[PDB]
Amino acid sequence: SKHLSAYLDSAVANGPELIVEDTGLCTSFMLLDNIPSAHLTKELIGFTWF
Amino acid sequence: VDIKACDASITYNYFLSVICGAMHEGFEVGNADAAFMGVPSTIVSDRRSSVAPYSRPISGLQTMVQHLADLYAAGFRYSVSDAFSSGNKFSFPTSTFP
Amino acid sequence: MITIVVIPTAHFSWTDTNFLNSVDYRLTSQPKIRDRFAVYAPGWLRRQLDEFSASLTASELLQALQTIPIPVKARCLLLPKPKRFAQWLLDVPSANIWHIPVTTLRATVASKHPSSDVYNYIPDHVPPSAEFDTVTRRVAAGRDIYVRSTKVLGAPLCLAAPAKYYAGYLSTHQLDGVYPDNWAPDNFHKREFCLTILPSLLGPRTFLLDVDADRDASYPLSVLWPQLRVLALKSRLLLPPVALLRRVVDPGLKPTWSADSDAAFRALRLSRPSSASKPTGFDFSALPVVDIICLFESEPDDHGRVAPGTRLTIHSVPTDLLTSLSIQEGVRYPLRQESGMFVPWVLLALLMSDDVTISGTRRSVKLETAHASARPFVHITVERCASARVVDVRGSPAMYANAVCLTLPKGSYKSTIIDTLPAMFSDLSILEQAAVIDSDALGDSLRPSFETQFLERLENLDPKLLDRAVASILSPASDTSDDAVTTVLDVFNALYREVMTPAQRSRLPLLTQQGRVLAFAHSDYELLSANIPIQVVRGSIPIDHVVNLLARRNRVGGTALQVLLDYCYRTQASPLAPTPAGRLYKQLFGPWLMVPRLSDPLIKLRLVASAPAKVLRAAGWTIDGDPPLEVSCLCAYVTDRAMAAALIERRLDSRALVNVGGDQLMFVEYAPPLPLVSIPRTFLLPVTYVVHWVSPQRVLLNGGNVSFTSGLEWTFDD
To answer: Which helix (H) or strand (E) covers residue C290, if one does?
Structure first.
């Protein structure tokens, strides 16, 4: 606020950065592992498969 | 009326800084690329905007101011070599205008 | 042959063996890489640009240069004045390749006013009534050009005829300047890539290199940077430096087809196996630095998960600092110490850096390093080196070997760099703590300390006024709040002017006239008001000091006097653009950090100044032996004894005004100030140094105080 800025001729001589291209996956949401599964080794063997 | 010591009272911390800024801003109206007295235009970083800093050219006049302000802020560095005294030359800086 | 046009950055190293290194030193790591590049960028063109810089606008200059082919095959052939020039076509008749009549030639020899006729009708003759572009247009033709002036641009300029005609028509230095062009040509080779400082039409096979740093302000073509950048931007032609390392060029980061996980990319692995027995056993003026992107993270949640965190960019941290500390990429180091402060090495990285910004945008941030922020960071990981280049250090922030004063706001971490860093080595002489001057020294000198006296005066005011002042200073929106703060400022100014100035002025030799002094101050005014001939550098650190000093509780004031003093000093400081303090630190400590990387031992030096025994005895000193005494003013280090001896024959034009009291407090003064750039860049100096007798056993009794003058002479020692 109150950042009064004067118009400058050279300042506007930059042009916006229009060309931005992505080769990754067009997504914005992620699946997560919020609570990890337990590693059973003595009892309940086989109920989990990593 | 008369200033008590105008030479000793003109200084950078109050006076010259204001003048340097005004002159540098006052020269903005003009071709950014126009050498003056053999001093070419140069690129300087503008940091007025914390969100959008950048660098832009400035005319030779402004380049002169850039150095001139630097010199004034550094203060004049005199070297005394009085002959009446004996073997006592030295140098010390001061803000006193020439 | 793809071409990359290059514009040098702020402190681009020019005298480097290879221009290539200053671009990005990673390109030199592998033979398989360095063989893919040509450079061009000839010196003769460099000199021409240096001259014409003051006479052409950016648009004109770009318009003129852009058409020139890569290897300039043409030459500018200067013609001598007609009276001189005409004789050439008869000294060798076959040299009259235009076949100007003999009658006209000797008519010119006879005339009091030899006309331009000898030039007239000679094809491609350029009269002084010509313009820059006229030359450039002919340059595209590749054939040599005949000119009548030295101020020309685009092609190497050499004499057409032997020097005898131009002599008298021109003078020695002028006659000298054309010698490399007289035998100018050298070949240019068809590798995969060729860098160039010469601009060109940006296109499918020409690219603009983007380094993400400010240009060299002194470099004459930096003015072209905006126009070039925007044209490249609008067509997606910028190249980040990392792209050069890939086998095939593409503008981008994290490409699909490449993981960019290779030893070539890792800039931290700086290696120097090769050698050439060259005089630069080391060039301690060239310093490799890196820009790095680091990820910061806080404590994990109750189930071991962790927040996404934030990544910041640190600019131009010297690489040897990281290497010597065995820092490695992709390792999540702990960030916080036992007491919650930062681990020392991180602080060093911040201190010696130039700037810290958010990784993506270009917003600079001052990092906090205390208990202020919630969910504070506890882990740090360096991810990749955005850039890695060598930079020239010689005499950049500071100019004189005598001393230099750095101004920093109160609460900076100067203690860390001056104590922990040399202590982290403690094996090679870096400095003497007796020579560094803490900014608080003079304030501690008064019998009641300056802080105590200020406190004692201050309490006389009403507490509410003080309370209002402190709150206003903290609250950023509290504009001025004149009453409360101004009253305090008056007390501060009145006291400081009254007591501090004479006390400061009474320590003049202590600040400057020692061996080599490094000093700190809270404001340049502290020195200017006392007339102390020492260069002052207005530094700044990329960390929030206000919060930092808010954590220091064991002081005379209850953390409130500190902020008051901080504001007073900042108010007292002169308004000017301050520089990053890291640059000064790089100039001082940088070269030392490269010592462990060296392969061969060092060699000590000094420039002892003599002292006649007559004045010493006349001053009541008891001294054995007739030979004049000598005193070491400053020690230096090299490693190639051969060239070092070869460079020791210079006679410095700077006298020394030695002064010493009976208490053996010894002082030195150079009547012509000794500039750092005068030191050959193969040398190496300690950060601070203390003058001392080379052989204290020579003296047997200190008489009265002594002063004398002598010359200076670099010499070996054993």
So the answer is: strand C286-298
- Give the SS3 label for residue B50: coil
* Residues 6 or more apart in contact with residue C477 via CB below 8 angstroms: none
Resolution in A: 3.3
Q: DSSP per residue over C671-688, as a string?
A: SS--BGGGS-TT----SS
Q: Which two tokens stand for residue C298?
A: 């806080």
List chain C residues with CB under 8 Å of A13.
Answer: 226-227, 230
Please return the burial class of C436, using the count of CB atoms within 10 Å of its CB with bins 0-12, 13-18 and 19+. Answer: middle
Tokens 């009085």 correspond to B82
Q: What end-to-end distance do the CA atoms of chain A give, in Å?
A: 54
Tell me the chain B residues in contact with residue C364 when contact means C-beta distances shorter than 8 Å: 50, 53
The enclosing H or E element of C312 equals strand C310-318
Check if A10 contacts B (Cβ < 8 Å): yes
Give CA angle at C392 (C387, C394), nearest 5°. 155
Q: Which two tokens stand for residue B29?
A: 């109206």
* Beta carbons of C496 and C511 less than 8 angstroms apart: no
* Chain B CB contacts of A9 below 8 Å: 32
- Give C6: exposed, middle or buried? Use CB within 10 Å, 0-12, 13-18, 19+: buried
* Separation in Å, CA C701 to CA C620, C622, C696: 8, 5, 11
**Is the alpha carbon torsion for C248, C253, C257, C260 positive or negative?**
positive
Q: What are phi and psi of C400, to 5 degrees?
A: -120, 140
Nearest CA in chain B to A6: B48
Quote the tokens at residue C475. 């609250």
Which of chain B's residues have a Cβ under 8 Å away from the Cβ of C525? 13
The alpha carbon of residue B29 is apart from the nearest alpha carbon of chain A, in Å, by 10
| CA nearest to C151, candidates C48, C222, C228 | C48
* Whole-number Å distance between alpha carbons of C243 and C24: 11
Give the mutation candidate from A14, A22, A32, A37 for the C interface (greatest C CB count, under 10 A).
A14
Nearest to C226 among A13, A24, A36 (CB): A13
For chain A, percent helix, then strand, then coil, each to nearest 5? 0, 0, 100
Q: Which chains does A contact via 3+ CB–CB distances below 8 A?
A: B, C
Count of residues for chain A?
50
Q: Is B48's CB within 8 Å of A9's CB?
A: no
With helix as H, strand as E and coil as C, how does C575-606 read?
A: CCCCCCHHHHHHHHHHHHHCHHHCCCCCEEEE
Structure determined by:
cryo-EM
Q: Which residue has the tokens 């190249």?
A: C239
User: Which uninterrupted H or E stretch holds B43?
Assistant: strand B42-46
Contact A8 B54 (CB under 8 A): no
Closest by Cα among C663, C654, C458 to C564:
C458
> Which phi and psi angles does B28 have, rounded to 5°?
-60, -35
Please name the residues in contact with C163: beta carbons below 8 A apart, sequence gap of 6 or more. Answer: C175
Cβ distance C181 to C174 under 8 Å?
no
Q: Which residues of C touch B78 (CB under 8 A)?
A: none
- The rounded distance, in Å, linking the Cα atoms of C225 and C58 is 9
CB atoms within 10 A of CB B93: 19
If we measure between CA atoms, which residue out of C368, C419, C38 comes closest to residue C197? C38
Strands C706-710 and C656-660, by their bridges, are antiparallel
Q: Which two tokens stand for residue C622?
A: 């008891």
